[PDB]
């Protein structure tokens, strides 16, 4: 009855998936039928073997306390905290693997330093000497200092310069100034143990402290170091949606998050070995396509075509044209192993952190990265031989998109509209001016996942379109960014189409689309980098700026951790999917009201995107009046 | 002091001044007194370019206040601000037309006042060939009489036309600069509302040289932003009224260089305090090459 | 119905709790009614907001896969892994706070180095120079090297000397050699995220890798450094059970884990200022009593009387004589806040890691430890003022116990039976001889919690009595040790009463009780220290020795991590309470069968203690048969 | 091999050997023939102390094999091992009684054989005063005759009694040591079973000097472990049988010092390879202190 999607190519293959007799994420959601109201409210705890316990989400009725004595608010707050710890650990291991690769960069190695100017600037942030030194001794010293932020037990952590000093002292007084990344994860896991913390306020404050090690450390260093090794992203053209797959070419789909694998696969897609081999098996060439974050990482830097977002990963195999599905970690549906059995697709897992049963494990050798990527890519090209071309169905639907809008490239674009004799170059002042002047009402960050509880891509597009119509420039990462690319919002032509007068005028002068794709979900740090620079340039805190974050169709624990550190930084966050907190009245009051008194921002729960846009515009206008702009 | 609110305030101030001087018109001369500008075939060029209708009597001039009020939508959106800036320009023509009905010769030299149609044709052909690289609508008050002449004689030496309006006229004659059409220095009026007489230059240039019919407002604004290369230089303290008028020059497509601190908008509203290099920023902001 | 306990004092006060009209942990267990069969089997996953999902524990029937595609085995293995990660993080922060106190030790400070010979021996293990150096410069260098083991990202970790190299090489080949403590916690949390690990074997192997950072690092350093600062435990007499509370004295009950607080309170209980105040308010003196681990920590070192174990903590307040309940972290029932409202007892929380709502928070100032302990103890003495002596009911039931049997003291006791001219002194040779000869059939470690699903203390006593009857020496920690103390097993007289011929003969010669209390659950590292020395002295690995571990009434996630690293070390582990794994057939095969092929040991799930004892004796005889002893 | 199995092995071997020589008794002498030891008031001292019944004829000696079979419970528990060691001692008396029934004079010098009751009492009064600090039941074979005599003359010089049984008797006469009751050196027999005649010394010491009635086995073993200070020194390779006999000495409370590698048990079964200090380990393991002689000092 309810529509499964709004993308046509997504719907066409959903009909083929029904014909082929295979299961999809939509089909398994309907099989769950009425999901339990105790876990959807957060009033269930399994933190020991005295349980499992469940208390009533209605205060005053039913069972009031768990066996140990934990109230509904205590149970909810502890379940929330562990979601943040899980989300933090996902981005932690993400950035940890990136920093380790930087330590292993050598002149005669597969991994090299490509953006030297970024390294020299990042080294200054870590108090690393650069004058007269070799560029790889600098890279190793920065990696050592960066890795220390994950597990140092003495001293203070290193935080990026764009973090306003007003916000730092605000965390100190609140008592949530972050420590080591892994240290905070264990601290949350410790206090969530049975018989430990039993106070909603102190528990949530621990979650906020833990999330700060993600946005301003984990994701930041993960983004900081990826640009150094693979190149700082710049504006680059690409194509999106499932129509990028070529019937007469080798379709290798890179899925996952950790970019090191996908980066080597891209370089291995130019080896005369695999280019000629792709022709010897009867194909035109190697057609690389990415999905989710690892697809964003290569699209931002090399313009690799984007096959699709989260809930589309199953329908890519349904096409029957995917020869090699190469995945690493995070958000790789284990159903792909059973699904790929109904096709010739070779579902390949590579990282030891994410083994999948009944899949093809080809361990990515990080000591010989280029050789290992060639070996994996060879196994995908050789599988084109087993393709049956009568059953292949690639929907003829693909839309152009422009991405690559890193903080450096956005600043570079802003230099076009600066008068040579007046203002300073290489700053975020042009963006601060149009915000202060009022041409741009505000700036919104639309990120998030897909969720079967929401018509996929519908809430993402309705939110972005609503915001840009109200002269609110939108920046996007993750699957929300890929939803905009498929729809066709990442185009310069979308300014006159969907944006209001003010935003469309900014797009013409700067020569940019109304929606700025800023990379993967670890690249959300760029938005913190961006908003922070504007707050510092205006001598204010980030809780004073008319900024907002939206997660219309979030799902992962990473989304929980992402939203938390955005609020603690001082940016209002809207949630399109209700988090499991409805059973704790005090927890709801903390997240949607009391948070304002702590960090100058709060969470918003609104399932209707049209209602959220109204709330975002009204909240921004309120902060504008308070600031006098 | 929100920029949109500042423009809306001066726009409402411009309307209130137009209602005041048009009430003087109906009381001293009645609703049927001839309203026209000397040697113009387009009646009121700004109101003509917007509505395609000519204004003949005072009763129509009074009924043209309704045009100003319609453009003063008070919502903080850009299209509302450019419309509000146009409203100030229309109201400046109402005030300036009333000046010509209350007095047979309201502007006396050194003030030139309104610019006749034959001057448009004469001054128009070098603008197309680029003999005069642009026009400079410098208005306001300079902090020193020497810096006013230094800038105007710099613009004059570049070969382009400069238009003085406000106290800078007094600062220019003190600066030993010589005015005149052949001198390419034209003082319009001491009142702020006299800036419409350089605005009518570009609009009439769109009607004459562009062959555009009256009532094609969006097309007139395109011709002004692309063909005629105008820029306005505001000096000294800026009242709410002149700030509202600046948005009208933005609607035409002309950047606004100033020395006063103001919420800047790229390529459209900039603040340059260094008077020695002010000429250089203005030529760049309008893409003017000598 | 089933009896709630086997302790008489526990039953007497449970009736007073019914008379006074207050709820206990037993009352809240019955209110939970039928706990869910989905969470008790482990076939429920809440690792994102697409769920909550539930699959069928019966393979082949019902719903088989979750929304993301995770099978029942994947969900179980991931829920199990997070239990291990939580238990590791609990002991991690425990030892982390201890190592930090060692770094802050000074000559004229509240925290001093008491066992310099232990420190000098530990310094050699960390490659720290000691010759001719100041004793506090040594202590600071050891603390830094110890703290590095929690979050170092490069190099290898420092492992204790008693770890056999055969076991190290076994872990390396299996791929579970530990990294940093916090690093492994985040690694498990990463792979348990949705779309990550989906293989039962690799998931459990990650849990094994994480658990090793607890027993051989976290718990080990916490115990090693506690002995350095507070003194290595030696044979000391004490009294146990709830009869230790004195009606005419100030009854301050120390509950929790972190020993620094309880240690300072003991020293503050001798201040002449605070002694006079205890008399001025109408009391005889300060009567210190401990509970759970922090009660063992002070009892092992200073002979402080032990009030009771886990499920007795509520009944201690029911007496109406507890004036001050000082708690820090871990295993403090949040119901104590609501329970203490029905009495004059001042329920005081001290650590910021475990805030409890409606309690009295008096932050333990680690910068002024003795002063802060005095201030907290004064508020407990001042609360004796509010005592109602008509409502006080203290059962006259307490049994003597002997504890303080550290590895050093056990070796010292073994020197009594060494011939001066024959063997070497200060070795574990006497214990290895009686084991090889066959006088002692084996050695068993009975640890664990209490659980409402088992008649409390019944499974502990029936297991210990059964083992010592079969000539199997028993060592005990945690609440299982305190259950033996209450019953009266920690006495030298228990040899003739309950032990077999072989064990009773060994007890007479060595002059020790048949059950050796070895301290808290972080002191379980002492048992690994002990078993390792026996394995090294006989040139074999630990999977060859006739050793076994029992957790008759476990409950906490800490127990899961404890049981895991005991199995990974190579010691068979029996569980008296079923862990939530019954829904995953492959996970059960891994934990109860395939583990033997991996680490030479496996888990056993047996709820009947008499059946478990039989399994232990038969398993030991097999390993003796395999070894030729 | 597992130590418990090694004790069970020699105990079953001792039973099989006892069944063999008692079968010779019923064929050459019939089921009714006098069975006794010279000048003993306790019949069979080991069997008497355990059951309180005396053995007179061969039919009763044959019926006393059931005592050995009852003591050989083959479960790996300590109390079963001490009982199995006692079974070997009872079987050693059965074989040794059969030696005295098949031959009127089965033991010829230098072998003394059985020790009479008047010798026990004569040797008993100095034991209480501590005149002889202990007894040393050294059996087996030394690797060198000099190291054997070096040890036996050391024990004799300490004033305590030593009892030889096995090949060490031949090594002692080669080593020029002198035997005799007054010399506190008694050679028993060349067969392993002849060690039982020193076991009967301590048992009879419990019956005579301890006043304990026959059949109070637990009390006899208490007297034996506390009062009489005995220790056994086993030298050379150890068969399963002699190992089984060692468990009997443990039941009496006597440590077993040896030079052969063996699963040690503290204070009960130890391995000392250094023959020069072997005497000192034996004196310590049994708590033997030498009585010094100090000249009297008067202060009047
Ligand atoms: S933490 Fe408490 S409420 Fe939760 S399952 Fe455990 S005993 Fe029950
Ligand atoms: S264990 Fe809890 S979350 Fe799971 S199905 Fe049962 S009530 Fe729901
Ligand atoms: S990880 Fe899988 S089973 Fe768990 S909530 Fe997510 S979709 Fe459901
Ligand atoms: Mg950045
Ligand atoms: Mg000229
Ligand atoms: Mg060294
Ligand atoms: Mg006792």
PDB file of N, CA and C and ligand atoms in Angstrom, chain A residues 45 47-48 50-51 53 66-68 78 194, ligand 1:
ATOM      1  N   UNK A  45      16.208  -3.619  28.876  1.00  0.00           N
ATOM      2  CA  UNK A  45      17.624  -3.710  29.201  1.00  0.00           C
ATOM      3  C   UNK A  45      18.040  -5.171  29.280  1.00  0.00           C
ATOM      4  N   UNK A  47      21.503  -5.873  30.088  1.00  0.00           N
ATOM      5  CA  UNK A  47      22.879  -5.633  30.510  1.00  0.00           C
ATOM      6  C   UNK A  47      23.390  -6.640  31.538  1.00  0.00           C
ATOM      7  N   UNK A  48      22.652  -7.712  31.807  1.00  0.00           N
ATOM      8  CA  UNK A  48      23.145  -8.812  32.632  1.00  0.00           C
ATOM      9  C   UNK A  48      22.202  -9.995  32.441  1.00  0.00           C
ATOM     10  N   UNK A  50      20.394 -11.384  35.010  1.00  0.00           N
ATOM     11  CA  UNK A  50      19.196 -11.358  35.841  1.00  0.00           C
ATOM     12  C   UNK A  50      17.954 -11.108  34.997  1.00  0.00           C
ATOM     13  N   UNK A  51      18.100 -10.364  33.904  1.00  0.00           N
ATOM     14  CA  UNK A  51      17.011 -10.103  32.998  1.00  0.00           C
ATOM     15  C   UNK A  51      16.782 -11.243  32.027  1.00  0.00           C
ATOM     16  N   UNK A  53      14.866  -7.651  31.277  1.00  0.00           N
ATOM     17  CA  UNK A  53      13.799  -6.908  31.927  1.00  0.00           C
ATOM     18  C   UNK A  53      13.163  -5.919  30.961  1.00  0.00           C
ATOM     19  N   UNK A  66      13.290  -2.149  36.940  1.00  0.00           N
ATOM     20  CA  UNK A  66      13.919  -3.404  36.592  1.00  0.00           C
ATOM     21  C   UNK A  66      14.369  -4.150  37.836  1.00  0.00           C
ATOM     22  N   UNK A  67      14.927  -5.344  37.613  1.00  0.00           N
ATOM     23  CA  UNK A  67      15.285  -6.215  38.732  1.00  0.00           C
ATOM     24  C   UNK A  67      16.349  -5.568  39.612  1.00  0.00           C
ATOM     25  N   UNK A  68      17.355  -4.935  39.004  1.00  0.00           N
ATOM     26  CA  UNK A  68      18.378  -4.273  39.805  1.00  0.00           C
ATOM     27  C   UNK A  68      17.862  -2.995  40.452  1.00  0.00           C
ATOM     28  N   UNK A  78      20.809   4.388  29.295  1.00  0.00           N
ATOM     29  CA  UNK A  78      21.918   3.458  29.111  1.00  0.00           C
ATOM     30  C   UNK A  78      21.887   2.821  27.726  1.00  0.00           C
ATOM     31  N   UNK A 194      25.735  -3.038  34.704  1.00  0.00           N
ATOM     32  CA  UNK A 194      24.737  -3.121  35.762  1.00  0.00           C
ATOM     33  C   UNK A 194      25.344  -2.660  37.080  1.00  0.00           C
TER      34      UNK A 194
HETATM   35  S1  LIG E   1      20.756  -4.103  34.126  1.00  0.00           S
HETATM   36 FE1  LIG E   1      19.147  -4.393  35.754  1.00  0.00          FE
HETATM   37  S2  LIG E   1      17.117  -3.976  34.751  1.00  0.00           S
HETATM   38 FE2  LIG E   1      18.697  -4.446  33.141  1.00  0.00          FE
HETATM   39  S3  LIG E   1      18.543  -6.705  32.695  1.00  0.00           S
HETATM   40 FE3  LIG E   1      20.171  -6.329  34.275  1.00  0.00          FE
HETATM   41  S4  LIG E   1      19.166  -6.625  36.331  1.00  0.00           S
HETATM   42 FE4  LIG E   1      17.556  -6.242  34.730  1.00  0.00          FE
END
